Amino acid sequence: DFPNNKETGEALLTPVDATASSHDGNGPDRLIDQDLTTRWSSAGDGEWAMLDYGSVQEFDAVQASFSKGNERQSKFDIQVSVDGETWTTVLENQLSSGKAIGLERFQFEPAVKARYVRYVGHGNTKNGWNSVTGLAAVNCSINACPASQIIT
Numbered sequence: 579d580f581p582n583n584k585e586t587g588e589a590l591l592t593p594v595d596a597t598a599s600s601h602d603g604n605g606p607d608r609l610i611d612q613d614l615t616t617r618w619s620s621a622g623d624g625e626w627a628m629l630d631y632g633s634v635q636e637f638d639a640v641q642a643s644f645s646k647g648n649e650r651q652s653k654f655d656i657q658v659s660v661d662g663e664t665w666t667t668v669l670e671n672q673l674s675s676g677k678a679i680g681l682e683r684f685q686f687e688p689a690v691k692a693r694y695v696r697y698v699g700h701g702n703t704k705n706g707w708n709s710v711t712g713l714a715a716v717n718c719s720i721n722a723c724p725a726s727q728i729i730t
């Protein structure tokens with residue numbers, strides 16, 4: 579329902595750091611490697627993974643791909659922050675499609691200011707695991723927001 583999305587745009591920004599509240603060895607670096615075969619995994623409600631973009635940027639969406647994303651739905655919020663201390667929730671009570679392993683986009687408007695973007699997990703529809711294979715913040719005004727990342 580965002581009709582101004584485009585199929586091409588500028589390169590996605592590269593985070594300067596990716597961190598997490600915890601993980602099982604499958605660390606948050608595996609969010610940012612453009613590889614569906616690697617994941618961040620952390621069990622429990624409220625565990626998080628955070629991307630630091632190094633400076634304040636504007637974003638109106640995330641794209642995320644989910645472990646076993648064709649078998650179960652992941653539950654999550656997205657928060658952002660200018661300073662890394664005060665957080666704003668931009669997406670709440672999100673649910674992945676449960677219908678694909680590739681990138682899915684979760685978009686809002688308008689774009690907001692953020693240096694730091696974080697995925698706050700609430701497990702999945704089968705169990706408490708937060709297991710994500712890819713995460714990136716995006717700005718649909720300047721980056722591609724492909725129709726193929728709307729799953730249904």
Ligand code: NA
Nearest residue numbers: 608613616711
């Ligand atoms: Na990965």
